[PDB]
Design a protein around this ligand. Sequence first.
Ligand SMILES: [K+]
Lengths: 217, 182
Amino acid sequence: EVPDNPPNEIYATAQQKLQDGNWRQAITQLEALDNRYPFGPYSQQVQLDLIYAYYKNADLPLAQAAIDRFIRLNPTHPNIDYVMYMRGLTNMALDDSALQGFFGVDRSDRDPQHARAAFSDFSKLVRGYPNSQYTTDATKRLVFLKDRLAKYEYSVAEYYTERGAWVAVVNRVEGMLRDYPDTQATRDALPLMENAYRQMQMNAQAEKVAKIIAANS
Amino acid sequence: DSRYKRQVSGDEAYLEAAPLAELHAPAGMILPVTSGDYAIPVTNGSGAVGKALDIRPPAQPLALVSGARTQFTGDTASLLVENTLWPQVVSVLQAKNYTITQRDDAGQTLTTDWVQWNRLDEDEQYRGRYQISVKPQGYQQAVTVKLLNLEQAGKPVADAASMQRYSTEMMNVISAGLDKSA
Ligand SMILES: [K+]
């Protein structure tokens, strides 16, 4: 329960708790300020500090809420790009902590759904703002994420293979070819696709797949 | 400490991820180049990556003065106050103990010596050297802060992010000082 001081003294306080690395307390302060003075003269910097603090404090779905509100009320803001970048970082953290909570006991075909969300976010950034100071890094991450995503496709195709579900296999790998043709996991999956076709006795198709496998050593 | 404060979470292992390659098409077969969702546009760059990238919110100058618009643009922050603001600014600067190295009272403009900054979120602290002035711009009036040079650990620094942060810091000191009287 934040006391009833003037907006500026609360910001000052919020700033110190922020620099302190003391996230919860900054969030309390910033929150109160945001709620009490929504028409504040420096409300945006409040909203940015929150997004920042939720991220550091790992309140990722909360960070996402602030991000979303901010984008919609400030579509042309000079810093709209940082917000977007932050929104990617958010999902990417959700994803690291999903994998981390299942360490030593995971499934290869766990859906990395926060990774897909991250990917979504970062593309918007890099397509919308190619000259953004965050676009190099975001691109680096898109590459890493695309690879993770296709790898998931591979795991599903492998599972169905292990169970002679041949149609589920060609449908899956065909997906990989349509969506992630340029990933390692797609190259690994083609042998699965060839197998499923040879199994289904579809040799013309199977041989095309072979022709492709070979043209990519 | 305070690196963790300025830094993305997780590790840098994504920088290790192998480059993607377009799929070679056998003879007798054409293949679409990567396209649609999941297609990544080429960039080169190049801004900071991984732990070198500072994810603190961009410093936008505050309107700690009733009915006053602010703006930032390059290395210059400013504040449109709604005259004789010049002597007031001078006192705020003097109050904070910033040496002034030259002063044009008629021109309402001055240059500071190096100003030492000190924040808990920085591991090596910054120093900045400013040209401050009040332009009779309306009425109303404009108080502008220009970051001429910025130092850290003795080395010059000129990256946008930092220039904006520490152009904005001076502008804030001034605003707050203008508020704590008017
Ligand atoms: K990572």
